[PDB]
Amino acid sequence: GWVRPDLGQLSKVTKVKTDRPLPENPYHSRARPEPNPVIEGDLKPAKHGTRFFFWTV
């Protein structure tokens, strides 16, 4: 009682049920080092202006 599949039936996703646990760490990844400590705060103006030699402002 076998029925041959149609033109576009064997070429689709299947959603197979399994009991094997999902591998939580594929590629055997390392620690992924933490990023730089981003600075937060209010943007105050530059102290005493540009501080470029004799320019006061």
Partner 1 sequence: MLKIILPSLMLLPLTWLSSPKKTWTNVTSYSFLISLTSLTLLWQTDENYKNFSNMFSSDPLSTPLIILTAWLLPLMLMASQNHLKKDNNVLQKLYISMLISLQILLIMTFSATELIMFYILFEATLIPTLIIITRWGNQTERLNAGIYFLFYTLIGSIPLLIALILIQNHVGTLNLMILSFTTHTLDASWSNNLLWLACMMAFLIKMPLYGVHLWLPKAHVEAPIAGSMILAAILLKLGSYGMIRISIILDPLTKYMAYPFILLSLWGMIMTSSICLRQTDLKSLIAYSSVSHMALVIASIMIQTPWSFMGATMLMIAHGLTSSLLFCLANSNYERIHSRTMIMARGLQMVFPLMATWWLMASLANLALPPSINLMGELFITMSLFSWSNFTIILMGINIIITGMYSMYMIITTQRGKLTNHMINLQPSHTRELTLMALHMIPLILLTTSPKLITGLTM
Which residues lie near partner 1 (CB under 8 A)?
Answer: 53-54, 56
Q: What is the dihedral of CA 29, 21, 10, 13, to 10 degrees?
A: -70
> Which residue, 27 or 52, is less far from partner 1 as judged by CB?
52
Q: Cβ 46 to partner 1, closest distance in Å?
A: 16
> Which residue, 2 or 52, is less far from partner 1 as judged by CB?
52
Distance CA 24, CA 41 (A): 38
> Which residue, 33 or 45, is less far from partner 1 as judged by CB?
45
- Residue from 37, 38, 55 nearest 46 by CA: 55
